[model samples]
Target: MFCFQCQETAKNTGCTVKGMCGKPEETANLQDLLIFVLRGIAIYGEKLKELGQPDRSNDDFVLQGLFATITNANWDDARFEAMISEGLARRDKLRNAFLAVYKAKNGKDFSEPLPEAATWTGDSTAFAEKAKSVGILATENEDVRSLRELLIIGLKGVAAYAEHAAVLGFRKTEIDEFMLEALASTTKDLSVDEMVALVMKAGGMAVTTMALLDEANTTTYGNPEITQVNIGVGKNPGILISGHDLKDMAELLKQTEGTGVDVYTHGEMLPANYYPAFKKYPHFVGNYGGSWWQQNPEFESFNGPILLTTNCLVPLKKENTYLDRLYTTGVVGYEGAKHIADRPAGGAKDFSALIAQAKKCPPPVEIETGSIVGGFAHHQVLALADKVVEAVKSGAIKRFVVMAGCDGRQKSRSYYTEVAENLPKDTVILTAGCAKYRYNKLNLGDIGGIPRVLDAGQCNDSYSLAVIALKLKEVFGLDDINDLPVSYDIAWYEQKAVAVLLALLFLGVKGIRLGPTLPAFLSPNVAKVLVENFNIKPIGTVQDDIAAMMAGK
Candidate 1:
């Protein structure tokens, strides 16, 4: 098995045996088979779209399938097998539907040569072997492989966030169609320029999808407000909900109310604390942990049931005893962990299992005490635009560093913390995603009224950072967004961060610093193209990066 769709690839190349994220060879191969099946669906889906009869029958499946394939999202091998089986059934059904529509429209029997992905059929037993020949390395051309993988990885991120929106009853056909078209493009020998265009198109769609999710979240849960989230533990047994699904957060909170089981956000779910809709639940406590990577000790110490609503779920260590207390929902799965079924039509997910488990457990062991301030998504930032502009114009805020993206277990990630700690007092750090865990608790003082770290919520909310930059550019009367006093120093660990990076690129933002390392999927030539065209650079020493960002590099 070979995989390299994340920042933590082995030796900065590919993971050929076992994934660094603890995914075994079989599970990795199954994920590849699932992607292959999705490609088949995309082939049919794209064809139908060209006939002006776009098929959205596979949108939800496609979204969940892609999201399930994200790094550290699902470790259950059986789940991937089921996804592949379901995807193949969908692919075949969509193909028949497309053929019928084509023949009816053209007044002739539809006859066209199709790609292997469009025709392949096999059971779960054939999946591992078939995946061997259809993986990323299947593409012979280095540059083409690089571009294709980049597009696919970014789509994974888009699908992950898009699924969150879909869960909240928001759907966008254009975004779904773009995903299909992008997946279909990988099956052909497209030119470098075409591949690059598709990648950039994915970026534009990423922005749209993220905006739709922002709307879904805010509309369903109300706008996130500036709130000081508690980091302390309560006396009652708590159920920690991790990952980035607010719908699950909402339902869990509602069900656990008056049950003596407190609900606390963990990982990316930490931002769920900022939404106004959740504030009404007296039993809904604040966040309970740091980033996703710290879940082993944190989840174990919590001494309560933990619900993972989305990706970045590290597989349980043998020594860790929280496996029985772990519950997964919404495309997340792990072997031996309780799986919560999807919500029925016109109904919410029953988190009764989690609530029941929490009631039997003891209160979370105190890990930390104090509160962290956040909830600076686009609307909130724009509401404080006048004050922000004043800070900039009066020379109180010298620069804004966009330190957004994921966090990993790599020790090299300490650079982000040091950079945040050493940046000029006048500069503010605009962050989203778990990457902020690096230094968010540093108690970085405010610049006048604005907090030093303006967190815009989860990785999806990186869209907020982009919006803030564009609005600030307009406010400062700058013709070019690159002329603004902002520098991007992003730290990516997974595909969602890739989508965020591509979104920034589509916005014409340049001179971005990405680290602890660039994606292993990028060929040298593709990396050079990004460098020459966008001025993208790798992170330097903390002191040097801080100095450069201060000078608006």
Candidate 2:
């Protein structure tokens, strides 16, 4: 299995033997096979769209299938096998439709050579062998491979967000169509210019999908408000919920109410505390831990059943005691962990089992005992637009640094901590995603009444960050967003972060600094294209970066 779809790929190249995320070679290969099959589905989906007979039957599967391939999202090989088999059936069904529709539309039998992704057929037993020939290394041209993978990786992030919105009963067919087109494009030979254009298109779709998700989230669970969330443990046994699915958070909070089972957020789920809808739950306690990577000790200490609703689930170690207590839902999977079934039509998911398990456990061991302030999402920030604009014009707020994206286990990530700690007092750090764990707890004082580190909820709420920027730009009367007092120094660990980066690029935000390192998937030439086009650069020293960002570089 050759994979380099994430930031921590081995030696900044590719993970050949095994994934750095603890994904086994077989799982990785199977994931490749699943993506290979999804590409086949997309080819037919795209063609049907061209025939003006677009099929929506496979949209959700396509999104969830791509989402499952996201790093740490699903590691269960059986799950991959099931999806690959199901995807082929769906692809063939669409293939038959596309052929018939073509003949009906043009009055001739449709006969055209197709890409391998559309034509490949195999049984479950042959999946591994078929995957070997279609993996990442199968593409011989380095630059082409780089561009294609970049597009697909960005699409993976978009799909994750799209799936999140879809689960909330909010979806844009445009986003789905673009996703299908993008996937099918990767299977066909395209010029560098065409591939790059498609990559940028993915960026635009990322922004659209995220905005749609933002709408879904805010509509379903009102706009996030600024609040001080307790980090202390309650006396009752708790249920620790992680990952980015707020719908799950809602259902879990509802089911655990009046059951003596306190619900606490973990990792990306920390933002749930800021939502007004969840605040109504008396048993909805507070966030229990930091980002996804730190879950081992955190989950163990919680002494309760933990539910992972999405990606960034670190695999359990041999001595880990929380494996039996871990529950996964919505595309997240593990070998021995309990899997929660999807929500039934027009009804909530039955998390009664998890709540029951939580009731039997002890209260979470106290790790920290303070409250953290967050919930400065777009609506909240835009409500403060007048004050922010006044501060900016008066020079009380010198700059705004967009320090958004994911957190990782690498030691080099300390740069974000240092940068956050050392930024000028007048500058505000606009953050989303788990990257805020780097310095969010630091006592970085506020500028005026606004806190120095303004977290706009989770990573998908990076849409919030972008909204804040564009709104600020309008308020500042700047013709160009880059002309505003904001600098992007993003830290990315996975595909969702890649989607955010591409979205920023599509928004014409330039001169951004990305680190701890650029994606290993990027070829030198593709990286050079980004550099020359957008002035994208890797992070520098904390001091240098701080100084440059202060000067609005």
Candidate 3:
């Protein structure tokens, strides 16, 4: 039950007793074994390809299997047990094929020193027993453990994004192949340096998968733009949508259209309001709440059926009253929560049950009544290049802080709020993800006509922040990205943030600040490499970090 795959790992070391995210020991062990089996599939999938038989046959299971284990994504042990059975069935088929091919090609049977992950083919009880030896402790070398987990966790982030794109009918086999290869390599006897290099490759694949998802989103819906979204409640019994699945959001919006149920966005779904397609829906209301960690009170007061499409679901507080009405879909699951399934992508996902249940519920308890502005995505920011550059030249905008990544429950996260509140009037925050919830509502005032905070959308839209930075670099004729007037102070919680971190490192962005703490998986030696090579540092106090940020100016 030792799971340190997230920022909220117990004591910033590991979650051995139980997950802080509400996953019990039994559930955590099941998740570990499920990853072991996926790595088993990766073991065979990688070899089968070299034998002239590339196997992407289980890409969905591989992707979803990893995704289901993401923090707060799935909590149903039955669902993971099902995936384990499917993985073994697929693993055996490929293992046999690879063995036969190896014998035929080299006149010898394939019998390398296989790790337990590659060869452990067992049933329910057997798997449960074997799972104990396969977690972070399997590699006793802290540095190796750190590097391997870094690669695997980054791949988990990639799988989440890849699964999102696949749901939208977009496929990239190259990425699919690399995902399998990366998983297989986790079980390999590789050097620390080799594993570190592979981590960078995982970052590149994450970038590719996110780019594909961005295209899938824009092509399927429309490019996000500058729009103000209502944070107020509507009168009807509305459906509150959270998590990051646009496809499911579209379906829920469609099903609830004619019904009396109004649809409102929450958490990561906040960006859905900025899309042209969703904006056209008469019943598609506005964002209902802040980030996921703050959802219990928000969801409790919503008084309607809430659909969680992905991760960052906080443990329900003692007063939680929305259990009966909470519905989960895709990889998101809870033991007692209702789950909806749709086979064959683009098919109907019958959410009528949720909608029907909502009809009998009361209208949401109004939390606030105002419009918060956003939708400054890549295209929107790029379109404003002229004015932004002018602000830079006129010395009206001094620097941009890339305050991206997730939000956590720790009070230390309040530093982001204080930093934003006290930042110089000329500095603009280039933000994405739920971390922006800390200060986005502050009415920080604009420099000239541009808002003090330029939100580029959700966590994945950190991609947009990178694009904007690179664009700024190009416009300013800078030779290096660090030379641009931007500093990064990221707050991470889950594997998606892991991917974003890897992507930033791969992009050669230096001197970035990460907090509220460094990853527990990172050995001091491994973390030191990042510090010396990439200039990465942990966050300081609000006043100190802000002074350090504005020091050179």
Candidate 4:
């Protein structure tokens, strides 16, 4: 049941009893086993692909299976059991195929044999053995471990985007097959250097995956535009939709139309309000709450149905009044909550049930007032390239700090807010992901009516930050990204953050500072490789880190 995949792992080490995120020991063990089985499927899928007889269906299953193991994605035991059974069935089918082909060729009844059943399933006593052999976490070398974690994190991001594309009926078979092959390779005995190379490759794939999702989202919902979203609440009984799945929010918004239910975005869904397609919904209100970790009190006060469309779901408490009205979809699953399964292509979701329930619930508690400016993506930011460059040259903008990634429940994460507060007045903070919640509400003043903080949207929108940097590179005509005045100080909580880190690495961005603590999964050697190759470092105090960043500038 050992788990340490996020920023808030217990005591800055692995969580072996119950996860700080509220994952039970049993659930944690199941997730590990699920990952183990998925890797096995990946092994077979890779073999099939190498032989020029790849199965797209198997590849799809493996990708989705790994995605399911991501933090806060699935906690339903039954769902995971079902996945395990399906994986075993797929493995046996592949095994049978290989055996039949070999037997036919040999003509002497000699056939490739499946690994014994013991190799597939074992008792708790054999958990370590099985986990070591099949799980991606078994990488013991520090450098290789860091690189592998880096790659796996990027894959998680890839899975997140791929899953989004799936909802839009966009299928990329090459990406899916390649993902399976990569996961399979993680289980094999690869050297530290080899894993380091793969880490960069994963980052490149992450970019492609994000591009695919951008196409899927924009083609379906239209491009995002600059929009002011109300952080305040309305009088209607609102259903707060959180997480990053815009498609689900759109469906629920349509279903709740004229049903006396108002839809309000929360957390990562805050960006949904900036999309052209979603903003047109008359009943769609505004963002109701802060980051994912604040949901304990926010949900209780909202007293309305809350739908978690993706990750960053904090565990619910007994006093959470909205628990009964909570709904989870896509990869987000919480125990005892209603889960909306994905529908077929062009099929509408029957959110009528949730709408009906919301009718009987109370309206959300008013939180704050005024609008927050967001949706400053690559396109939008690049359009302002001249202004940005001029400001920097004139010393109106002294520093550009990229504060992107997830926010966590740990009190230490307050360092982000402290750091933001202490930054030089001329330095603008560019943020994405829930991490922005730390200081987005603060009145940091504006640089000629342009807010000091620029949010590019959800975690995956870190792509927007990278795009901004590349554009900055072009503006400055710099050969290396390090030549830019921007500093990278990111806070991470889940695998998606891992993807963001890998993506930055893929772009050859160096000297990034990550905190409040390092991932426990990495061995010392793995961490050393990252520090040596990329100049990656951990965060210190707000004053020290800020000073260091400014000094470098």
TM value for model 2: 0.98
User: Which lDDT values do the candidates have, in the order given?
Assistant: 0.90, 0.90, 0.87, 0.78
- Candidate 2 lDDT over 205-320, as tens digits, reads 99899999999999999999999999898999999999999999988888888888899999899899999999999888898978889888889999999999998889887778
lDDT of 4 by residue, 256-319 (tens): 8888789898888998987888988888988887888888899888888888887767787766
Q: What are the clashing pairs of model 3?
A: none
Cα displacement (Å) at residue 306, model 3 = 0.6
lDDT score of residue 89 within candidate 3: 90
Q: After aligning candidate 2 to the native by TM-score, how far in Å is the CA of 172 from where it should be? A: 1.1
lDDT of 1 by residue, 272-340 (tens): 989999988888779897998998999999999988898878987789999889899989999999999
| Between candidates 2 and 3, the TM-score winner | 2
lDDT of 3 by residue, 1-553 (tens): 7989888889999988888888898788888889888888888899888778887889888888989888888888889888888888998998888899889999998878887777777777676677777776878878888888888889999999898899999989988999888888877778877888898888888788888888888899899998888888888998899999999988888888889899999999999988898898889889998878888889999999999999866668777878899898988888789998865654878898998899999999998988889999999989999999999999999999989899888888898999999989999998888888998899788988899998888888999998888998898899998898888989998999989988998888988899888999888999988889888888988888999998642
* Model 2 lowest lDDT segment of ten: 468-477
Model 1 CA deviation exceeding 4 Å by range: 104-111
C-alpha RMSD in Å of predicted model 1 compared with the true structure: 1.2
lDDT score, candidate 3, position 91: 89
